[PDB]
Amino acid sequence: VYQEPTDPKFPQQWYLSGVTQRDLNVKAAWAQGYTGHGIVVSILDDGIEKNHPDLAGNYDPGASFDVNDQDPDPQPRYTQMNDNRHGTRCAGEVAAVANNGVCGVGVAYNARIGGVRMLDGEVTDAVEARSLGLNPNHIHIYSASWGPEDDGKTVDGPARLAEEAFFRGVSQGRGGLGSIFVWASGNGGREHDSCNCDGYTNSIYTLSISSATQFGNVPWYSEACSSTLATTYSSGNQNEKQIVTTDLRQKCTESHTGTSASAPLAAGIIALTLEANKNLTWRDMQHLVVQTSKPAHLNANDWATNGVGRKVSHSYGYGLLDAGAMVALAQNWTTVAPQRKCIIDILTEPKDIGKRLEVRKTVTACLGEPNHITRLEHAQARLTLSYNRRGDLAIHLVSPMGTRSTLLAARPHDYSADGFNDWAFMTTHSWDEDPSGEWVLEIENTSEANNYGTLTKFTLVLYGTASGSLVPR
Ligand SMILES: CC(=O)NC[C@H]1CC[N@H+](Cc2cc(Oc3cnc(N4CC[NH+](CCC(=O)[O-])CC4)nc3)nc(-c3cc(Cl)cc(Cl)c3)c2)CC1
Ligand SMILES: [Ca+2]
Ligand SMILES: [Ca+2]
Ligand SMILES: [Ca+2]
Ligand SMILES: [Cl-]
Ligand code: NA
Ligand code: NA
Ligand code: NA
Ligand code: NA
CATH class of the missing domain: 3.40.50.200 (Peptidase S8/S53 domain)
Structure with a gap:
């Protein structure tokens, strides 16, 4: 027809x-x-x-x-x-x-x-x-x-x-x-x-x-x-x-x-x-x-x-x-619940990057609060760091469910010494996961050069809801 x-x-x-x-x-x-x-x-x-x-x-x-x-x-x-x-x-x-x-x-x-x-x-x-x-x-x-x-x-x-x-x-x-x-x-x-x-x-x-x-x-x-x-x-x-x-x-x-x-x-x-x-x-x-x-x-x-x-x-x-x-x-889709936002300031002190830096933190995702998230949508790692050659950095974020998101791959042409000023690296790869548990941030120098810098802030920002989940695929 x-x-x-x-x-x-x-x-x-x-x-x-x-x-x-x-x-x-x-x-x-x-x-x-x-x-x-x-x-x-x-x-x-x-x-x-x-x-x-x-x-x-x-x-x-x-x-x-x-x-x-x-x-x-x-x-x-x-x-x-x-x-x-x-x-x-x-x-x-x-x-x-x-x-x-x-x-x-x-x-x-x-x-x-x-x-x-x-x-x-x-x-x-x-x-x-x-x-x-x-x-x-x-x-x-x-x-x-x-x-x-x-x-x-x-x-x-x-x-x-x-x-x-x-x-x-x-x-x-x-x-x-x-x-x-x-x-x-x-x-x-x-x-x-x-x-x-x-x-x-x-x-x-x-x-x-x-x-x-x-x-x-x-x-x-x-x-x-x-x-x-x-x-x-x-x-x-x-x-x-x-x-x-x-x-x-x-x-x-x-x-x-x-x-x-x-x-x-x-x-x-x-x-x-x-x-x-x-x-x-x-x-x-x-x-x-x-x-x-x-x-x-x-x-x-x-x-x-x-x-x-x-x-x-x-x-x-x-x-x-x-x-x-x-x-x-779309036809019978039930509107998602209002968006919740859970802010977690991770560092207790600035951290030297060197050749490799790993930051691990176990979070409750705002347990007991109106912004408690059990069903993630977007997640951001908002980072503030200094580094002598920005393009030599590769950054990964691993969720509690073991999903490794590449937040930044090495960029050979990026010679900037300006670093990142509260840059909100975002991942959609953990959509619908429960964000409670251990998150791991990995920052590595992908070059053989003796590069240097410091991570001064890492805020993990989770967006999502606490209802309506589907049975996993
Ligand atoms: C502190 C402060 O105030 N900072 C101000 C800056 C202002 C700049 N922005 C960054 C910025 C740059 C940018 O530059 C472009 C100029 N031109 C072209 N193009 C496409 C190829 N065209 C040829 C195609 C063909 O012929 O096939 C030729 C023309 N693309 C990009 N475009 C955007 C932009 C924004 C929106 Cl919202 C919608 C869209 Cl689409 C694009 C944003 C960051 C903030
Ligand atoms: Ca036509
Ligand atoms: Ca681009
Ligand atoms: Ca005109
Ligand atoms: Cl917001
Ligand atoms: Na997996
Ligand atoms: Na900017
Ligand atoms: Na987007
Ligand atoms: Na968990």
Whole structure:
């Protein structure tokens, strides 16, 4: 009964559907009746060609703004180089019109789509805050494919206004259910970048996404880190297919690439899920992703089983998004209990790092208090330390259930002597575990150099609830 789209380039959208299983299971969500109707997504990028023949029918001025020129119209700036085309490509991934004889289709081909023109100029904290905080009671999902430089030597995150915009978004946005911020984990793979050094993807408020190639491999541009939640397909080598979407100047492209093309596909899957249950909160959406994502046939040398029986990787998080499973589980989902936060200051004195430092601490996770957590969501190790060559450090955190999260891998290009100033390294790998018991922090100098420094603060911050657990996998 469900008729698949007839768009000319739809058969080339290999990642949406097919008889092989190398796809995001989007046609199963469309067949259940979910195509994005009533959901509003906004792309935070270099602008959106609102008059594109495959975007105009779904374009929403209420989901759009131009923060670079301070006006409501996010039309890109046209140049000979076609420099401002990325937002239009991302918009088509989410919501390109279906059955109109043009290009392919979006994952949520009936959703409303807009864009914030924010990257075609100087990106300041105010520019970021005004983009993240745009029309929060109209826009449901924000998709951002970029962040601090992916040079493998930067440590940066949202400054005060942008962090306040995330707080306001998840707390009061979407009628109090919370704005959904979808983020790409980064394109710094060739520079050996480690994505927990990017405070936007490392945030608990962003649902972070990495990439897999068509043949199920970790692409050259992928960044590994413990803050990633899940994966979508994107580009790989020149024998693997790429993303097919709308392009600038009313064109179609078959060569959209990078993790920056994975985040919009996740935003479209999240739009289908929100149509299936409009009452899902920002945390319910992250729980659905953890429970339904699929590791099968994704190749990595770090797949590990966590404390509740789920496989998790630093390259893929919980695995590939599965749109059919997401929309099926959303329908009767019971809203998670309010978020609890348990703060544990670990050190009794500063500790010399040297070649290797291990800090062990047994915690009760706020036993006997309103913030008692027996079911973890995100965990952070907020560290303050000095070190002469930052990139030589590797940091791991082991949970009481034995789950080893790499908080920071060695970054050869990071020569900074600035250390970390209360940097909140985050892991999603212990989701649903009981955080009571022994936690172990390991900081090691991965080089033969006689490096030196001191760890002056280690705060373990646990987020979660004390109810609603599933029987382990
Ligand atoms: C103390 C204080 O005030 N500090 C202020 C700083 C301000 C900076 N931030 C860090 C920071 C930098 C940053 O820089 C970018 C500029 N441009 C591009 N790009 C993408 C490739 N494009 C080409 C694509 C193609 O052609 O294919 C060309 C254009 N990407 C990144 N973008 C962001 C950011 C923020 C949000 Cl919210 C949404 C999105 Cl998306 C991104 C954040 C940290 C705080
Ligand atoms: Ca404008
Ligand atoms: Ca189309
Ligand atoms: Ca990065
Ligand atoms: Cl908080
Ligand atoms: Na910073
Ligand atoms: Na995140
Ligand atoms: Na384990
Ligand atoms: Na325990």
